[PDB]
Amino acid sequence: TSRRWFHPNITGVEAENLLLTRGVDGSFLARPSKSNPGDFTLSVRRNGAVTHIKIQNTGDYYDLYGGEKFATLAELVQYYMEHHQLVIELKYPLNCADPTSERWFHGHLSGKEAEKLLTEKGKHGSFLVRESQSHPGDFVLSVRTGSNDGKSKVTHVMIRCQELKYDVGGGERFDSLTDLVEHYKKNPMVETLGTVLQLKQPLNTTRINAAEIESRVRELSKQGFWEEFETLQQQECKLLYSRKEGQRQENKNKNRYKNILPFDHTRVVLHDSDYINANIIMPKKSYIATQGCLQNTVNDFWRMVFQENSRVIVMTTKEVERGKSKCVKYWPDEYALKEYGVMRVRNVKESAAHDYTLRELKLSKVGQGNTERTVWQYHFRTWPDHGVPSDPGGVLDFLEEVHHKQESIMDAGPVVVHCSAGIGRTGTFIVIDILIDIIREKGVDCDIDVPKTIQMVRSQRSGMVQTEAQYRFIYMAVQHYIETL
Numbered sequence: 001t002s003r004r005w006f007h008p009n010i011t012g013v014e015a016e017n018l019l020l021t022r023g024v025d026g027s028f029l030a031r032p033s034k035s036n037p038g039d040f041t042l043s044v045r046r047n048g049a050v051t052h053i054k055i056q057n058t059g060d061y062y063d064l065y066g067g068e069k070f071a072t073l074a075e076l077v078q079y080y081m082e083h084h085q086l087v088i089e090l091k092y093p094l095n096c097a098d099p100t101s102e103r104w105f106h107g108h109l110s111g112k113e114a115e116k117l118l119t120e121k122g123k124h125g126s127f128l129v130r131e132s133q134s135h136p137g138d139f140v141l142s143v144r145t146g147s148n149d150g151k152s153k154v155t156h157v158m159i160r161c162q163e164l165k166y167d168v169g170g171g172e173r174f175d176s177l178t179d180l181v182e183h184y185k186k187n188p189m190v191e192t193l194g195t196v197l198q199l200k201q202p203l204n205t206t207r208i209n210a211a212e213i214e215s216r217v218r219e220l221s222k223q224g225f226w227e228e229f230e231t232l233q234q235q236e237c238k239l240l241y242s243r244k245e246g247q248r249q250e251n252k253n254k255n256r257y258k259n260i261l262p263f264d265h266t267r268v269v270l271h272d273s274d275y276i277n278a279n280i281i282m283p284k285k286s287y288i289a290t291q292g293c294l295q296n297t298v299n300d301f302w303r304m305v306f307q308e309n310s311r312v313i314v315m316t317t318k319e320v321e322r323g324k325s326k327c328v329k330y331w332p333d334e335y336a337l338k339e340y341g342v343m344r345v346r347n348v349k350e351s352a353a354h355d356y357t358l359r360e361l362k363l364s365k366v367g368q369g370n371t372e373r374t375v376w377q378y379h380f381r382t383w384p385d386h387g388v389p390s391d392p393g394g395v396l397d398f399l400e401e402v403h404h405k406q407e408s409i410m411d412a413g414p415v416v417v418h419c420s421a422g423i424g425r426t427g428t429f430i431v432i433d434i435l436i437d438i439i440r441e442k443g444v445d446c447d448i449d450v451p452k453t454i455q456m457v458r459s460q461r462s463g464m465v466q467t468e469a470q471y472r473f474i475y476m477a478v479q480h481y482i483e484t485l
């Protein structure tokens with residue numbers, strides 16, 4: 001679908017005027033808050049007037065004031081538009097023409113730099129659009145078709161801006177670069193002598209050699225970080241997979257947050273009553289991304305760990321933060337034995353480090369003493385209440401220990417990771433782990449692609465990695481890991 005209802009570069013005044021002049025009753029857009037940076041604003045028109053509704057994100061979920069909690073703004077907007085009541089109606093998305101957040105748009109990039117990138121990083125059908133230095137307000141579409149043999153080339157197409165409309169010198173005049181690019185992706189320009197200018201994929205400029213991380217971070221820090229993140233966010237509209245199972249009446253009470261649900265195609269199905277709010281994550285270590293246990297899902301959590309042959313649990317929340325319950329205690333006190341339905345757990349021993357507690361747990365099925373296995377619970381305890389850690393050292397040291405534990409156990413199943421909703425902190429830990437894993441195996445001369453890896457994880461559980469602050473912290477963690485090798 002589209003995410004054109006998000007306006008990245010708009011003020012609250014510009015939004016009102018846009019809704020009052022170019023919209024009607026039931027029209028809406030979403031945008032950054034200017035008065036609460038890191039937060040967002042749903043701007044709706046009702047009775048010839050505009051209401052601004054605050055969306056908070058502190059790292060766990062998108063909290064809509066007077067509404068529900070959501071994994072993504074796209075899942076939020078799909079929920080309300082599919083009247084699934086906010087009464088205030090989201091009827092008519094008001095579309096953004098600003099190309100800032102398209103994968104293929106490179107703003108004030110030179111034709112020199114453009115041609116280097118396309119030559120080095122481009123393949124057949126790689127394209128980009130950039131501002132023209134020559135013709136202020138115009139753009140250049142550059143497309144590669146096919147490094148020594150001249151079997152490939154770069155064609156440059158001038159895009160004219162005339163009275164707010166865009167064209168390639170003839171044919172249709174479009175209201176936005178996006179319209180122009182979508183048209184010629186569907187109906188490719190052909191050259192006099194036969195060459196088809198296939199716009200097959202945006203040029204990849206996010207993949208870097210690992211050694212260049214410090215360099216890429218310095219570039220992103222002068223602001224490139226915000227551009228790259230909001231471009232990733234715009235791609236979330238491709239990940240609106242079904243979560244039907246999590247919406248069944250008998251499964252509603254098993255979700256910590258009603259509208260933060262596992263995708264059907266990657267959910268953990270419990271065999272031998274089949275449902276848990278948990279997804280398999282495959283990047284080679286694999287993972288289970290899940291929520292903090294509720295009182296009524298502790299039994300299901302242990303059925304999942306047993307079934308999946310999980311030998312390591314990563315908990316990235318306290319039980320209680322800012323006086324709110326994030327996760328029920330699902331482990332026995334040290335030396336104690338508990339039964340959780342058909343699953344029996346002994347807490348064999350706890351060891352405390354600064355940033356974490358390790359609990360050595362023995363898990364078996366009641367009735368069958370031969371089913372016993374050790375499950376190691378790494379409980380990270382120093383994650384801040386607001387934002388992300390100032391230093392990644394504690395998280396990297398933690399993950400290094402988790403990695404060694406997992407590697408030490410023959411045929412260990414996926415690593416269980418959870419926070420509250422199991423999308424923000426959980427996503428952040430899992431993406432750091434996957435990226436470091438690559439560098440650990442394939443060495444400092446390997447390619448990493450942070451947004452590609454996040455998009456791949458977000459295809460398996462909604463909204464994995466919640467904030468720009470987490471996105472920055474992932475880059476910082478990968479940089480620190482590279483700097484100490």
Ligand SMILES: Nc1nc(N2CCC3(CC2)Cc2ncccc2[C@H]3N)cnc1Sc1ccnc(N)c1Cl
Nearest residue numbers: 100102103105106107227228231232235451452455
């Ligand atoms: N986060 C992403 N960033 C980019 N860059 C960086 C940001 C800009 C587009 C190019 C550069 C720019 N420069 C100036 C102004 C505005 C802008 C942005 N539009 C491209 N794609 C993604 S998402 C992505 C990547 C890799 N793989 C998959 N699967 C996915 Cl979804």
